[PDB]
């Protein structure tokens, strides 16, 4: 059967298992089960499933070149789908909690979960906690007998932790590090000295690349029992490179994509985020442009936001983006070539992952 | 060395390991490490450490009757301390997130973490996420070589999930189950039909007993490689019984203990919580008393809160509490007797746990 329909069918199976277990082992009543069903659907469904489907696609690649009984092929594909849903539910956790943390209004054209009338922040924080707990229930149930259970749980933990650390890097990126202090309300930077390429790269590496690219690629290897088919250092390098490019695209869209195509109103400027646009602008601006940026960035005032967007537009950041893109293309192709030494099949799966990202 | 000083020494070691790893593997800078150090201290230290020390005390009990090399005794005690800190950090996670969810003001006489000036909700939600992620880093690092790693991680996951489910039961306990609906803002019950002993017992079982009593007792058995010394069904029964009594005491104190001894201003009445006091009052009130309760419960108005406390005082709930306590004493002693069939030593550790709870 087609990959996406298998993946969606496994969602229904996993959902039924989780809710049936709540009834048989956690004393849940039907109305609370219905609440949790709706919560799961609303927070986990509706995206493109790129992360989860990467697990499936990696596993499919190895199936095409490896000898297996049919029942083993089916088991591997089912495991890849469950692992993919673990990643989708991990993302759902972070999106629920991040939307609360950031006071976000919409996501994908619909209200953020905490804003639903019968949810509220009091429930939504805990709903997000449940979403991540479900990833572990999935693993322990479906992968109980599997040789890769330990490695998969360990990997998942490290990626989850890296993501939380990256969230810290993101939410504090507009403050001066030397002034961080739980006792003192945090002012926005005035010098923007920490708006550098290396600091930006650290935010992005931790907040998105581990869970968006590294985890799906490695989970695909694990469910395929194929980690020996790769040089793991290369997998990490290519995941972090593609993931950075993905986030750069998101940063550009936050400012310039119309809200109707973006699914929300972008507020990176008002939030004073260390975005690719801000770092790149500061890397080419003259003194007068720097001063005008400082007088306007990080303010909710629409007039000041408009000034910042004007500065970005006049700064010809399309030039810098094309130069960045051309360099990423160079480096990603080089890493794919190196991956071919040990596994042409995995290299091809990464090439597919890159094509989908680049042409998004 | 004395048990508490070993436990506190292990805290410093674990903290140093976690922060050193953030520097060596997660690219953290010194100021963010300092923020996280302060966060860990503020959220994890200052309580009585009853949960973590239960792990240590259970392990000490088995050490007194089991033949081991000295280095093995030291390893077991170190493992018990690390496991105990996993439980304390799990609690710290739930307290950080619960205080945000509930809009709480103080905890232990100090501001809730999210209210610190340089924290804010935006950071504190993620700080709570980090606290629970640290429990897993502890386990994978310190217990990497241990035969009990799998069982301990599986147990911890189930208890974490049960606690989140219990949080859902608690936050929704003042609503009618048949009206739960993410799409519709939730009104408080008017009939109080779900304020029953069995529904109360479900809230308490999941929201506190698993992590407060079951997890420390079983973790103590696991680090001692002694789970075969017990009938696990009895361990569960006695943990859930003692844990319920613990929460009943907390419910009584929320209403009647002066805020200076309580560490916070109790708001269970204004919050319309399904507390032991409310359930027990409704189990003995006449029609006029029920009507007066309904007209006043779940309102912030101090006059209405005062009415509810008057109703509780005039209802002689001390009578019901002494009858409840006498029954718990009966049942806990019976379960301790049954535990002696397979392990007098573990039975004694449970007797100690009960004495500390009862005389609190
Ligand atoms: Zn955010
Ligand atoms: Zn963005
Ligand atoms: Zn609460
Ligand atoms: Zn309480």
Would you write up a description of this structure?
- The structure is a homodimer of 360-residue chains.
- The first copy, chain A, is an all-alpha fold.
- Chain A has one domain (1-360).
- Chain A is built from 14 helices and 2 strands; from the N terminus they run H-H-H-H-E-E-H-H-H-H-H-H-H-H-H-H.
- A two-stranded antiparallel ribbon of chain A has the order 1-2.
- In chain A, helix 6 runs antiparallel to helix 7 (197-223).
- The longest helix of chain A has 33 residues, at 70-102.
- Chain A is globular, with a radius of gyration of 22 Å.
- The two termini of chain A are 26 Å apart.
- At the A-B interface, helix 2, helix 4, helix 5, helix 6 and helix 7 of A face helix 2, helix 4, helix 5, helix 6 and helix 7 of B.
- It is classed as transferase.
- Keywords: Farnesyl diphosphate synthase (FDPS), Farnesyl pyrophosphate synthase (FPPS), Trypanosoma cruzi, apo structure, zinc ions, transferase.
- It forms a dimeric assembly.
């Amino acid at each position: 059967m087609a990959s996406m329909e298998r993946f969606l069918s496994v969602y229904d199976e996993v959902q039924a298992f989780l809710l049936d277990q709540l009834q048989s082992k956690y004393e849940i009543d039907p109305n609370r089960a219905r609440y949790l069903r709706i919560m799961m659907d609303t927070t986990c469904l509706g995206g493109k499933y790129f992360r989860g489907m990467t697990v499936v696609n990696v596993a499919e690649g190895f199936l095409a070149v490896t000898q297996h009984d049919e029942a083993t092929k089916e088991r591997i594909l089912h495991d890849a789908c469950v692992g993919g849903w673990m990643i989708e539910f991990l993302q759902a956790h972070y999106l629920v909690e991040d939307d609360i943390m950031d006071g976000s209004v919409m996501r994908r054209g619909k209200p953020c979960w905490y804003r639903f009338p019968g949810v509220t922040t009091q429930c939504a924080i805990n709903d997000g906690i449940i979403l991540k707990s479900w990833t572990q229930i999935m693993a322990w149930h479906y992968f109980a007998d599997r040789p890769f259970l330990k490695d998969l749980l360990c990997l998942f933990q490290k990626v989850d932790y890296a993501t939380a650390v990256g969230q810290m890097y993101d939410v504090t990126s507009m403050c001066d590090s030397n002034k961080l202090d739980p006792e003192v309300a945090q002012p926005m930077t005035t010098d923007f000295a920490e708006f550098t390429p290396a600091i930006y790269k650290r935010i992005v590496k931790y907040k998105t690349t581990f869970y968006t690219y590294l985890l799906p690629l490695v989970m695909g290897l694990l469910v395929s029992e194929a980690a020996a088919s790769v040089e793991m250092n290369l997998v990490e390098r290519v995941a972090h490179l593609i993931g950075e490019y993905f986030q750069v695209q998101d940063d550009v869209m936050d400012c310039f994509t119309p809200p109707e195509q973006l699914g929300k109103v972008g507020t990176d400027i008002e939030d004073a985020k260390c975005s690719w646009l801000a770092v790149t602008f500061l890397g080419k601006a003259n003194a007068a442009q720097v001063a005008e940026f400082k007088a306007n960035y990080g303010e909710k005032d629409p007039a000041k936001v408009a000034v910042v967007k004007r500065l970005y537009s006049k700064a010809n950041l399309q030039a810098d983006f094309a130069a960045y893109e051309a360099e990423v293309v160079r480096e990603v192709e080089s890493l794919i070539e190196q991956l071919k030494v040990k596994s042409p099949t995995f290299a091809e799966s990464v090439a597919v992952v890159w094509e989908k990202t680049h042409k998004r």
